[PDB]
Structures are given as structure tokens and as C-alpha cells.
Amino acid sequence: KGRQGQRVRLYVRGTILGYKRSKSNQYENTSLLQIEGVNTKEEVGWYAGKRIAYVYKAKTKSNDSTIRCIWGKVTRPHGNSGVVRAKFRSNLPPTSMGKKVRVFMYPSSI
Amino acid sequence: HTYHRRGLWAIKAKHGGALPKAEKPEPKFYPADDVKPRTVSTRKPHPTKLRSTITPGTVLILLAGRYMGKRVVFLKQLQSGLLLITGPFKINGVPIRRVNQAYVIATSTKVDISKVNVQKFDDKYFAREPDFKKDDQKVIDAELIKAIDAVPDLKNYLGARFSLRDGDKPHEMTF
Amino acid sequence: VSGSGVCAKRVVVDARHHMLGRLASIVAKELLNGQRVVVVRCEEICMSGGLVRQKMKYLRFLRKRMNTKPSHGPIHFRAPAKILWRTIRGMIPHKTARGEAALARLKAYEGVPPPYDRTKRMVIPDALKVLRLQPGHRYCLLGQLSKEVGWNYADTIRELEEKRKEKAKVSYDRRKQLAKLRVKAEKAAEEKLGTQLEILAPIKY
Amino acid sequence: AEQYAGEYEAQDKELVQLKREARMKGGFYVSPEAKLLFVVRIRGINAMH
Amino acid sequence: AVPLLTRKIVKKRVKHFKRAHSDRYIGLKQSWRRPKGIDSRVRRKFKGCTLMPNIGYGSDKKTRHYLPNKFKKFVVHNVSELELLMMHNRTYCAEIAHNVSTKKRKDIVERAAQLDIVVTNKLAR
Amino acid sequence: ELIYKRGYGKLNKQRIPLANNKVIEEGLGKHNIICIEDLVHEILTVGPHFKEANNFLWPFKLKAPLGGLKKKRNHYVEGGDAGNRENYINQLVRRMN
Amino acid sequence: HRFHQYQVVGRALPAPGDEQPKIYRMKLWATNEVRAKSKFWYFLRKLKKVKKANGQMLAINEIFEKNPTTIKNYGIWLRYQSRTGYHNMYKEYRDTTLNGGVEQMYTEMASRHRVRAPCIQIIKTATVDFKLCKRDNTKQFHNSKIKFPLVYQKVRPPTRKLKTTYKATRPNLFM
RNA sequence: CGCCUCGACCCACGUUAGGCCCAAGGGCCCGUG
RNA sequence: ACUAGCCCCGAAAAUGGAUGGCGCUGAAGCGCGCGACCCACACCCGGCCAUCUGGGCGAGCGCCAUGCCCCGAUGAGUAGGAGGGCGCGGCGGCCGCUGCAAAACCCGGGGCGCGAGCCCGGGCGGAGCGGCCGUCGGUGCAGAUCUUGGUGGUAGUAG
RNA sequence: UAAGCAGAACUGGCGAUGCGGGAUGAACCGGAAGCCGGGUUACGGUGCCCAACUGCGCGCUAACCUAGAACCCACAAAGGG
RNA sequence: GGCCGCGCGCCUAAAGGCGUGUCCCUCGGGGCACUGCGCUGCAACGGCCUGCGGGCUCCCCAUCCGACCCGUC
């Protein structure tokens, strides 16, 4: 196969599920994120503190580029099944839930 | 969890510390506000700790920057705390550089670099300010290519970039 | 229940012999998380409780109707794929724009129409009847319930499905011949490069 | 502080000896009743008698 | 000159308290009025309703009344009032009054340049 | 652990952290309780000056119990929280301190 | 173990009338010691006329299974309160400890008769030789050639890391 | 039907009181610039 | 023969209908457990605002002393009370502005203040206006089938 | 006869009060409150709507009556199999 | 997640750190200690600075959550 695009991948793909919630109010200061391959609360600790980027295409050009980035990090696990809480510099737009996020390994303890 | 100031000794530092009285040390303008003058700080910030899995000659995968995924051999930890790395420049094209302890991953593969001289390389060598740099890079690989050739397949390993593929879980991989 | 996390273009699920409400529950979570789900063979979904209990449940639903204008009232779909579509809609905040977008990512079919006859169809382990229902308890198929309450395309679905299975059976025979050829090729190529593949021996399965 | 630390022991230890000796001659030694409580309020301040 | 303030200015709310139902009625103005009806949702502080100002929103005493340029404002009307900021030019900035003419604005802007006093609206008129 | 991590005194009706021994001295020195070890000994071994030492202690502000409770509405012997547990208050102090 | 067996010993408070009162012992099943002493004082008040305020608690000791690696047959005589009346019944269990039998008894009463723990009084516990077992479903496991298949397998991954929403084929399970 | 101003890799039917199995927990792909 | 669990009969109302809905049958039902998790403006630690409590500061290099600094706790509010502030118009004083453009009015302009409000910018306009201290008053509007005036939808309709 | 009826005793509550749960609700359960950051709980929950297990374990039930499924609470009896 | 007030007047050592004497403790090596005056806002590095750059308390729209019409008896 001869493919085009990125040559290496040093991130894992996360999906935004929503916000820290109860049945009756929600909190934008933290987002809930599902990381591919992370199935338990125990193996979430590997990803704790890892940097996260939300990449979206805006409508105008900014630095001769049409793509914007919002940076965040994994803060803690959420529940028993691998979902995590993430804090971004600005709160994620609710329109971003269901979209993809990139989880890096930049701050490395190993 | 050691208590350095466990005992009120303070004399193992200055044994012959019985000394005499201390001698204490026009503005041309007066600032109209009593601003405490700024003198240099006398605090020692306790240099950074190297990760225990990074030892001289161990291999590192680069996690970010323009050389993301490059498998690179580790040489030394600089005074500022940045690790000193080389590609070497022949195999993967990564020159001599200093990298943060983060943004690298320490693998369990090692190379002996005992007979390699990395002394003139230090923080001052990278001061923001090239022909001799090409010479220094040239004379540091040929001292290292052979040791790479010593281990089978290590040359093609160092010349390939690390990448994650379908089904790869970084939190389960041994490296 | 969270999403799959598998982040593909679209997952095709073979709905045969799954429990209806357990299948709809997992699919609804997938759609709400952003995944596109294609469900085929919705005529062979299973519901616990036999035909009789399931049939009268639909008849009670068929009773519901706006007294003054029935074409405004509840719409009672008869096909298995539209029945499963409505079961999933009941598990989604569909009056919001988010649930509107979620339900637009779901495709449901009776039988396996193209191009999904030549793609991979997965199963949901925690919706399969063989793992969810005791072997003696009653159940019915969705197509049987649909046939009892007005669906009239069961015969064309069955005739098309027999034609599809014939073509797949021929493709299966061809794939078995190519597999025997492959095993001979890896046997001959094993000795020709016997020395090189020593590191693969302890992980050979 | 040295005196108190060594007094916490030889009080726990003595109770271990006293109980053993009571069983040694076939009886029961009764531990002294508790003299100290730690009390924590577990309900709120709404609708109080 | 160089502002003497170094503590960061934080705002507990960069948002106005608009009077409840001033959106509904054209004649109601946005200036805050405390609701006082017996059944008022806004007075009773139901969630999702208009917020009411209270003393907990107040700003730090060290940074309150400081302009974004980290100076505190003093309005002047002539040159003599501008001379009073020469000993406080690191903590106070000068704003020329709205009705001062263009002839006198030139004089105040010249004198403030000599005294190193910052004028916030020196390019006006 | 309660008196070290959450120890506060009552000096002039004010809640003063027991960060040093001078606070305990200036509060209970007239009763021959000099430092935090004497205070601990007086509380644990209920002594001649327990009334002065205990009342000198401000009531402890414990956090919500890590791991939760079971049923605050009924007694400990019914499987709840209220009442006397007699040794398991130490397990409850572990999670509230 | 959820339930523990304790031996609780107490007496009425020594008073000038007697000054050497009689000693009472019980074997009680409780989740901890505090709940064992409360149940002891409950029975002493109702069976004797000594309640906690007039009595003294002498000793409390946990009883343990002698051989927790063998399988015993355990008979339990109990008293329970239903919605309409009181009844006594005899139950039989097979376990490696009598603790497991008592947990089994409490679970079975909760399921078959909807009886909660407060409405149950253990009259007597004992070990029964397999020759003297009375209830069926205990004798049928006394076969020395006992043989049967596993008719419910519970197909699941082992450690929850191997859990996936989708699978490429249906599971094959057999017995 | 007529008329034109980020490797996005992977096709068995069918049955689970049965068809070596005991999950794709696999396989394929220079996977290496 | 009796006993008691779940289940079934006993068990009938008018718009179509409600374990909240979809649905659920080794339950996603019932009884009883285990481990973790979710989750309030409640609890804990920390920052800031205010209230209250308690302190420090003169042979003053000395201060809106009605000030500043330090310490600890506290913060629900209809009817109602009180304090401190914001705004309108005069009079006695003080300090100013304006034809190099006052008042009023307009503005997806910029700020300050928790707030009442205030300050500036651009425009229009073309002759007056402001701030501080004291004192005084016909002094603050969303309602009263409130008064007067103006203007909508109804409506290019009824006719 | 009863009543979301009419009248007394003690205490609490609503009225005067938001906030979390009981789908919903003056009073029920939790808990009372300045503007915020972080951590943890109460009541109540963890198939989807909906944040949190289709978690680990034993039984019972099969409803051809709309089986059953959250204090107050939104009903059921004598009697039968 | 929020915060940024030991070190030198002896030497060697990038630097962390080491290096004196006294009495006691034993079972190998430490421990408690000498206490004399002064000064006393933690760092390193990067990109950008008139630009398709940064910010916004202003205007419009989208999305998620929350939200019943005020006054009055």
C-alpha cells in the first residue's frame, strides 16, 4: 500500500464525550474523554498528566493556517472503565463533544 | 526522607567558624517611592534529577519536535539538566543536540560509549549566537558507528522511526 | 456503558440473534459518541418473551392514536428496520440537535443489501441471545412479529437472502482453496528461509 | 517524650501479660473500661429537637 | 512612567448585572434594580435566573480602581490640576475632562510630557 | 494524628494552629503541659488536667470520610453509622483525618 | 468472611445480694464484635433477667474453623419471624467453614422466605456426618464418583483489559 | 424514461444440551524515508 | 394435613397513555451481600469581598489616627428596623470649564465600581455648564381598569 | 362512615428558602447559602435517555391479566390454585 | 491543583556534597553537640511585538446545560 499523509503517529486518539455532569447541572471546567485502548481505572494512571490537543479547522486564516489548537492535559480517571477527566486552557465548546482529540506522551515519567 | 538538619550541629560545615564581628559594606536620583532594591538571589535551586532508566549510551525515542519518533542514543546529562543526545547524524540524520528529559522515552537497549569523548559539548556550546560543528559531529559518529555495528541489527534500528500502529497501547508496551 | 472507542469510519453490525433492547442500548451510546453504525439483518433480532407477549405489546401500541387527527398521532412502523430505528430513538435525546445528529448516523436494513454483503459484520457480545437468555425461555424474531402486524416484504427479504447466501457459499469455497495454497506456500517458504525466522518460533501460536 | 513513649509500651505489654496469666490459672482477666471517647457529629443542623 | 503595581488584576465578574426583564420591556432600563416582588424568581435565587449583585463579588483592595494599564485615574481640567500628579506619576494617570477645549488640551499634554505623567486620552480632539 | 494534623488551640477565644510549642505553653503552661507530647499524653491518659487540656483544644474540623459511609440514619449495630463502635472509630478517623 | 462466630461471656453486676453472680456464655454469629456484644445483651435481657445496664461484660473471643480445607456438612436450627407468626426450621449446608454455612443460611432465608437478618435466631449449629444428613441436594453431592458437566459457562474476558464492544465472530462454547 | 436554453487493511453459512475451538485476545501490510 | 415465599384467579369506565420513557426475562424484576464508582451551594484545604472579635503604631524620620497594619470566627431571608453610599434641583461658600464649541441627544466605541452610578472617545448641536464643603427640597416609577399626549398589531381587514 | 373534613397536646417544618434526590410537586429524604479553585461526601443511584459497573455472588419468579420494578405516593380485600 | 520568601565571612568539588575538635554509645558507623556577629523579593529556555498578531466586559449566530409572567392579596 502506498499512502499519503502523516508518516509517524506519536499520539493516541481520544473522543470527547461531554462535561463533568450530574443529572441536573454540568461543569465546563472539566471534560470527559475516552482514550482508545484504556479499559480500566487502573491503567488510566499511566496517562495522568499527559498533554492533550483538540484540533479543529476555523473559518479564517491565522498564521497562513486554517487549523486551530486547544491544549489540555489528563487530570484523573472518571469511573471504573477508563474514561478520564481533562482540563483545557479554555473550556471546550459543547460542539466538540463526539469529536476526536490527540493524547500525546510529552511529559514522560518513563 | 533524611533529616539533614536533624542535629543542631551546623559546625560540620564551618568547623573553624569562630570568627570576628561582621563588617557591614550619592544616588543622583530619588525614586519618590520606597522600592526595595533588587539584589541577586542567593538561593541554590538543587539541579534536576535524571530519570533512573536513562544511563549513558541508552537509546531514546524522541516524542516531539521535528525529530519525533527518531531512535537516538543518549550520551550525557548537561549542567542545566538537559540530556545530551546524538543521532548519530549518519544513520538517522539527527545532529548533536540537548533534549529535555520529558519528550523522550528511555528504552532498555544500551550501547557502550566509554571510549567516546564528549567533553567539549556543554550548555555554552549551544549558546544562541558552523563549519567546526560539522567537524565535531563528524568525529563523534565514527567513534560510535562501530559500536552500533557491534550489535546486530542495531544500525537499522537506529535508522528507523518509532510509530504507533493499529491496536498499539503505549501503556502496555515494555519500552 | 461507554462507547467502543474503536474510532473507525463506520461499524457494520450483524444484528442476527441479538436482544433488541440490549442491542439498541449499545448502538445508541455509539451514535451519541459520534460513531456511524450500520445495522443489517434487523429481521432476525430477538426479543425475550415469545410471539404472544410481543404481539399484544404492539397491539396496545397500535391502540395509541390522536383521537382528533390520527395522521398527527403516533406513527406505527411495521418493518423490522423501522421498528429498531424507533426503539433506538427512544433511547436518545432526539428532540435536541445533538440527538438529531446522533440518530442521523444510524442506518438500519432488513437483510444485507450492498455494499455490506462484501464487508465485515461484527457482533455485540453483551447483546447476543446465546449469552443473554436461558436456553428454555421463550422469544421471537423481529421479522415474525413484523409479519404478524402488517409487514409484507418478508418474502422478498427471504428470497434475496437466499441468493446472497448462495454467492457467499461459493466465495467461501474459493477462499478455502486459496487458504490451502497459502499453507503450502508458507511451508515451502519456511525452509527456504529457515535460519532467518528463528526469532519467530517462541511466538508462533 | 521519651518517658511517655516508653509508657505506652509496658501498658499494652502488661495487659498482654495479665490476660495470659488469667488463662494460665484458668480464669478471665477483665480489661479496664474505656475512659476516653472521640465523638464526631454525623448529622446536619436542620430540623433539630 | 513605569507602573508600580505588580499584583495581577483579577475580576470576579467581567459582566454587567442587567435589570431583570429589561430584555422583555423596551421601557425598562438595564441599570440594576433589586427585585422586590413576593413571588419573584430572581429575588428567590432560583437556578437559571438573573443574578443579583452582592458583596462577595467585590474586587481586591490592592487592585481595585486600577485601569487596564495598571494606573489609577485622575481627571484634570487644566495644567495646575495636572501638576499634582508629578509626585505620583508611577501610580496615577491623568485624564483630561470631556469638555476641555483643544487649545487647553495641547497645554496639558505638553506639560504632562515634561513631567512624565501619562495622559490616557491625549490623542483626542 | 488528630492533634498533630488538625490541632488548634483556644487563645483569647481565637483558633490558633499548634504549629509550635509556645502556643501550648502560653495556653496550658500554668497546668504543667509544655509541648505537644504532654498534650497528647493528657488526652490519651485522662489525667488531672484533662478538662483544661481538652477545652483548650478547638473542636476538630474533619473532612468528609474518604470512601463514604453506610447508612447515617441507623445505628452501627444495624449496619449504619450512629452509635458506639468502640474500636472502629479508629478506622473512621483514618478516613476523616 | 462476612459472619464470624464469637463466644461472649458476661454476668450480672456483682451486688451485695450475691457478690459472686453466675456466669453466662453464648455462641453468637455477627459481623463484628460490637454487633456480637449487642446481640448477647439482647438474649441475656430476654432469656435471663440481666440487661446491659445491670450486667458486666467479661470476655469475647472469636471461634475459628479447625480445618478450613475440608468440606463439612452443616446443620442449622433456627427461629425466624414471617409476616404472620413465628416458625422454626432446620437447614443443611455444605461448606469448608461454618462461617460459609451461616452466610449461606442468611442468604437463603432472604431469597426463599424474604426474611431479613434481624428476624432470625440461630438456635443451634452442628456438623452432621454424611450418613446422617437429612435434606436432599446434600446427599446427592456425597457421590464419590460425582461427575457432571458445566451447563453455564459465563463467557467473559479475564481481566477487563481485553473487553471490546465488537467481535468478529460469535463465540463457540461447549460442555 | 423523454427533451437541452493518519494503516480509516479484512464478505461463511449456521450452532451453542455443539461445531482443533475454550473470543479479531487473530491475521495481513517494508510496519523502517 | 398444615405452614409461607414469588406467581396466577378474585380485579369493571368512559380522548390514546404512561414502573417518567424506551425497553428489560442466568433481568435492566424481587430478597440478601461484596468491591469500586457517580453525585449538592453540605464537609476539608486555599484565594478574594464584607460583618463581627481582639490587638499594634509619638520626648513621632510624622498620619485622609475618620488612617494603616496584624489575628480569629462568621455570611439564608418575606413583614419590619437601621447604617453607609449613588443620583436630581436650589441657596451660602470654594475650585473650575466653554465659539480652539456648553447643555441636551445618539453610538456593534473604551474603561472604573458588587451595585445605585461614574469617567473618557466619536458624532450632532450652537450657548451656556460643572465638581467639592455646608444647608435646604414639589428630589429617583413598571404597574394604581393611574393622567395627558403620541404610536402599533388587528388591517389594506370588517365593510 | 369517611374526607386533600372539622378541632386540641409536644416538637419540627413551610409561610420567609434557595441548593441535591424523590420523573414532576410549599411541607417528604439530604442539607441550609458571600465570589471562586482543588479534594471528598449526604440522600439517591451506576442498560440508554443520564454522570457512574450491562461489575463480582446465591436463590426466587415466567405473568396465554399491560408480570414486576424507589419512604411520603399516588390503592386493593375476604377468599382461592 | 494553587505558592515562590538557605547562604557566606575555610578549602577542594560544574554542582548535589565532603573535609575539625570534644564526651558518650556499642559490635562494624554514627548520635547529641561547637553557637559569633551580619546581609537576606527561586530559577532556565523559547516563540511574538504593527501582523492573516493578542485581547475584549461590545454586537450577531451556533452548540450543551439551566431556565413557566411580572406586580398583587
Ligand SMILES: [K+]
Ligand atoms: K430527466
Ligand SMILES: [K+]
Ligand atoms: K446640594
Ligand SMILES: [K+]
Ligand atoms: K390583589
Ligand SMILES: [Mg+2]
Ligand atoms: Mg453514562
Ligand SMILES: [Mg+2]
Ligand atoms: Mg394500516
Ligand SMILES: [Mg+2]
Ligand atoms: Mg431532615
Ligand SMILES: [Mg+2]
Ligand atoms: Mg464590571
Ligand SMILES: [Mg+2]
Ligand atoms: Mg467629549
Ligand SMILES: [Mg+2]
Ligand atoms: Mg474518590
Ligand SMILES: [Mg+2]
Ligand atoms: Mg449513600
Ligand SMILES: [Mg+2]
Ligand atoms: Mg428522619
Ligand SMILES: [Mg+2]
Ligand atoms: Mg424511574
Ligand SMILES: [Mg+2]
Ligand atoms: Mg473561602
Ligand SMILES: [Mg+2]
Ligand atoms: Mg444576609
Ligand SMILES: [Mg+2]
Ligand atoms: Mg424588606
Ligand SMILES: [Mg+2]
Ligand atoms: Mg442602536
